[PDB]
Every structure is written in structure tokens, then in C-alpha cells.
Symmetry: C3
Subunit: 252 residues, 3 copies
């Protein structure tokens, strides 16, 4: 729990350019762990905001022509500011439009973490999630987080598999979108984040989910979501250490 303590004390400004289905939830998730979310989308204020921010989330969930050039521009402004970017290529394998855009973005800007499910990361690189993550790491030289039944993180010389969470998470819209935000919350302006911050980010989210789903007042996916936020807000070190399941670790 080292990084989450710091988020609660320092309240890191976390800029989110995210999709319209999950903006509120993302912001509430970030507030619950003690970050300071800001959903700024205007390239006109990116330079001023990014000087003082700790990370940027770019999530293309509801990509449209209105967003494309603005996303490219703010990614460049982030790179020039030294602001780390968490990129979520939502449903990139579902259309050529999203594929072509994600290729353009990743040619145009360096991101610090690419986060997606196996199908999304596979689609970016053109099979085990670990193999897909390592291939993506070799192509982008950027931390890769692949969410799934077990989560996989590849960063630097390590690959790790994590095994926490609840099935109710799949039934809440934007769970993995909120995870992108949480990961941005853990970066503290490090453009090459320590794998330990990414492990903590993913573990905090998934452990909170596990605990929320066991709460006696969790009656389904509607009641789960408020509980998940409560649980993120209250999560303590004892619970984190008792529950964390980090299942394999591979050093290159």
C-alpha cells in the first residue's frame, strides 16, 4: 500500500480525457482513492493544466471526428510537458476506424502505459496474455497492462500475473475504464513507472472489487457500484496484504 497512501495525502491532479459513458464513474473512483480528477478536454488549456498534473488518461471509448485531432494535440502537449499518458484503446479490434486512429496516436506520441483486454492489445500488434503483452512491450517499449480473468503487467524486465477481483465488475459499465483512471492516479508524473505502482494500482482496484462483492449489502451490479467506491475509499493495508494474489513473476 505505499503508493495508495501517497495518493490519499498528495491528492494528485489526474487529467482524464475519457469517454462519455464513464466520465462520472471514473471521476468518482479517482476521488474515492484520494486523487483529484479533472476531465479537461480543451487543447487550449492543456499546457497550463499539464504543468501541474501528475498524469493523463486518454480513453477512446467514444471516439468521434470531434475528438481525433484534439486527442493527438493533447498527447503531444503531454509529451512536451513530461506528463505520463495512460492509453486505453477501447474496442480497437472492433473497427478499422479505431485501429487506424490508435496507430496514428501511437506513431504521434509516446505513452507510459497501454491498458486493455487481450483482444484490444492483440489488435494493436496486428495466444497467451503474457505473450501478447510481451510482444506489445517489444513494439511500443511502454508498460503494458492486459486485463482479463488474470491480469498481466509487463514493464521493463518483468512480467507479472495478478489474480484478484469479482465477476460483478464485468457487469458494471466502465469498470476497466475506471481502472485506466486509477492507474493514471498511481503514476506521480513518472513517464516510466515502476512496475510496483502498476501492480498496486491494479491490485487496489481488484481487491476493492472483491471486498465490495462480499459485502452483505451487495445485492447485484446496481448496489455493487456504490459499494466499490466505499471500498476503494476505506481500503487499508491489512486488507490489501491479506488479499493480494500475485501469481507469477518473470524477470527478463
Amino acid at each position: 500500500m505505499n503508493y495508495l497512501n501517497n495518493i490519499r495525502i498528495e491528492n494528485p491532479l489526474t487529467i482524464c480525457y475519457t469517454n462519455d459513458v464513464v466520465k462520472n464513474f471514473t471521476a468518482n473512483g479517482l476521488l474515492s482513492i484520494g486523487a483529484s480528477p479533472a476531465m479537461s478536454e480543451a487543447p487550449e488549456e492543456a499546457e497550463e493544466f499539464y504543468k501541474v498534473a501528475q498524469a493523463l488518461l486518454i480513453n477512446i471509448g467514444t471516439l468521434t471526428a470531434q475528438n481525433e485531432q484534439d486527442i493527438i494535440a493533447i498527447a503531444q502537449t503531454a509529451n512536451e510537458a513530461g506528463l505520463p499518458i495512460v492509453f486505453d484503446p477501447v474496442a480497437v479490434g472492433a473497427s478499422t476506424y479505431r485501429k487506424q486512429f490508435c496507430k496514428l496516436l501511437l506513431k504521434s506520441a509516446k505513452v507510459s502505459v497501454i491498458k486493455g483486454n487481450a483482444s484490444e492489445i492483440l489488435a494493436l500488434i496486428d495466444l497467451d496474455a503474457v505473450t501478447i503483452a510481451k510482444k506489445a512491450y517489444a513494439i511500443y517499449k511502454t508498460a503494458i497492462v492486459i486485463t482479463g480473468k488474470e491480469d498481466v503487467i509487463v514493464q521493463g524486465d518483468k512480467a507479472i500475473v495478478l489474480a484478484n477481483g469479482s465477476p460483478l465488475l464485468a457487469r458494471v459499465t466502465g469498470a476497466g475504464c475506471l481502472l485506466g483512471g486509477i492507474i493514471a492516479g498511481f503514476l506521480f508524473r513518472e513517464t516510466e513507472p515502476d512496475i510496483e505502482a502498476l501492480i498496486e494500482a491494479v491490485s487496489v482496484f481488484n481487491i476493492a472489487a472483491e471486498v465490495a462483492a462480499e459485502n452483505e449489502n451487495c445485492g447485484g451490479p446496481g448496489t455493487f457500484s456504490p459499494l466499490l467506491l466505499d471500498t476503494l475509499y476505506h481500503l487499508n493495508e491489512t486488507t490489501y496484504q491479506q488479499r493480494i494474489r500475485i501469481q507469477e513473476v518473470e524477470e527478463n
Copy 2:
């Protein structure tokens, strides 16, 4: 409960072009009944998405000049793909802007279900909800669903009145907007849906509402909403069949 069982097993890709106040709630209500919502608004991906989707919801709740040509373009893409459209002409009677746009949309594309309240449907056509629904059906030759104190569905030669639900539903924003999305979830790519699918869609939503409002942890409109989602998620055949209150006119 035939169709709901199929939603839960097949997880139908349900495209929703909806308004900015209700996107999250709509996606969560669709996820709760087992559908796979996708809020795609880019005409550039409509052809790919629609080929594999089961329905499209078009809801004009926050219509602006940024949306108008895109909505027309995607509705045409949907027709070409055989993807059925559910159209919600939100607040159409409140402005000439919305009236003109809904007229344009309905001259540009064939829709599969038109859903609104009595005042919205009346404004489309220009006193009883049943009469209004039957007049609209005669104009558009498209299933009409009028939500209200009692709901009315008219499809082909049948008209039905349903009498389930809760007053709390009006106090949760986008209830009816979510209903539009639930209806889209029950279409399974049928451009002329069976009246039984529409009856089930409306009935599942309303009965879930009724049951959520009776829950001992429902303390008002704020706790009602998460309960509604739980109740949609858990709704079973037994409860459906015990509670459903339907009449053929």
C-alpha cells in the same frame, strides 16, 4: 420471460446513440439484463459495428447541430445493414427544432419501434394514448410504444395496455431513456418485432421497478436506482408471471 432468457445467454450487441444525461445509466441497465451495450456515435464505424449488432437505439434527448447529420447518416447505415432502430423523439413537442428534426429522420429512414410519452407521440403526428398510438401506427407503419400511467403498445393489428411500474421511475433521470435501450435489447435484429418482444421488454422494466420500490432498502429515488439495476439483473420467471398486468384492447 422467453426473450429475457435469450438476452442473458446471447448477450446481444445493442448500439445506443443516446443523450448525454443517460449514457451511463442506459449502458448499466442493458448490462444488467445481459445485453452488450455499445455507445458508438461515429458514422465512420457504423457499417462495421452494425453488421454484428442486434439493434440500434436513437435517442434525441440532447440534440444539437453536432449530432443532426450524423444521426441521419447512421440511421441510413442501419437500414442498409438490416439493423432495427428504436427511436425515442425525446421532448419533440417542446421545440420546432426537435419537431423538424424528427420529421426529417422519419422521412429519411425506416424505424422499427417509436417510443415516447403521449405528448411526444402526439406532437409527431400533430386524446387517449391508445388512439394516439393507433394514429401513429397508421402513419409510420412501425410499432409504437407510448409510456404513461398505463403503457400502450401497438404493433400490426394488435394494441395492448400494460399497467406495471412505480412512480419512483419518473424520479430517476432517464428511466424512459433506459426503456428505449431495453426495448432495443429485445429486438434480436428483427426489423418488424413481434408484439410479444415489446410486451416483454416493457414488462420486464416495469416489473423490475415495481419490485425495487418494494424492497425494504429502497428509501427514495436515490437508493431506488441501484435497486432497479439489481432487480433487472435478478428478475426471474416466477416474479414476471406473478406480477405482469396486461390487457388487449
Copy 3:
């Protein structure tokens, strides 16, 4: 509780041009006290809607180029219609982009209530220390009711300044609490372009007392469960609870 009773009965149409993070919550908060929220953003329908509406909220939380000209246009349509505007200059102090826009808006239209935190109101007047002093300086510049939210809230309208001391710390941990409060204030205007300070005190007090009561509920387990409870509490709030809890001081 006077004005809240009228909201419950009259169901005032409350137009909200607000930010994308808080639309749904704002709308639900307005529904819970009995208002009729409408998130209309198209200038093409503003004249027709505004003729029948009771207030407009303008909140610039997620300002972009797509919004700028539209906001200016609707604000002018509101003035012409006699529709009172509640303006929330979110994060104005965080960029020159927002500062320039808020200066343009307030040179282009007359608003009826300006609501923000101390740092937001300060940035408005600086770019023209105590929250009371800030509120009075802003009132002098704009001749418009000022509401400054904070640990204690401040309201300045005409010759009166009031400090209110209700609420809960969980409100800060729910996104868009104060954004919703902008909406609630709009709900309490009833087409009065110079609202009585009493309406503003009630609007702020209803919200903060409901927050206080929600946070005491035995089912409140944190900021996730708090938000549904806040809505329930707004729905149920009664005069007995309001009069027992309200903590107000005239400066």
C-alpha cells in the same frame, strides 16, 4: 422550507447547460427536490424552451471550443427572455482559457447568481482572503448574488451577507456536489432575475442539511453509498428537520 414546497408542487423547468461529468447527477438531484431538469444545449431551441423555463444553469466545467459561442448565445437568449441565469465558473483560476471565457460571458450577459468556491470567485475578480470579503468584492463588481461554497458557505445579495454552516465532509468526495448545488439554486429561482436572499439561503441549506442527514444514515458506508442517500434525503426532507438543523449567521 417555503420555496422547497413550491418546487415540489410546481415542478419548475430548470434548464441546465452543464458539464459532462455531472449531467446525470445534476438532473437526479433536481428530480429529487421536485424540479423538472432539462439539459438542452442547442441554441436553436433556447428561445422556445426559455419562454417556459424558470431558470438556466450555465456551468463551464468541461468548456471546449464546441461550447463557447453556444454558451454566449444562450446566455443572451436567456436575458432577452427574462430567464435568470445561475453561473458556475468551474476551475476558472486553473487556466487563461477559462478566465478569458468567463470575462467574456460576464461582459455579454447579466447573470442572476454566480456560484463558486473561494478560489474560483477570487480568480474572477482578480483577473477583472476571507470568503466574505471575496463575496462582497465580487458582488460590488457584478451587482449579482454571489454564493461562495466552502467549509462555511457565504451568500451576498443586495445589502446582506450570510454565512451558513451545514453539510458533510463526504460531499467533497462525490464528484459534482457543488455542480449539483448550482442546479439546485437554479431550481429555487422561479424566474426571479434578482432572487431574494431567502431563496438562496434555502437552496444552500436544503442541500447541505440533506447532506448532513444522509451522512448520518446507518447505511452510509462511504462516498459511493452517500450519493444515493443524499438523493433520498433531498426527496424526503421536511420542515422539522430543516428548522432543527439549519445553522445560519448574518454577518
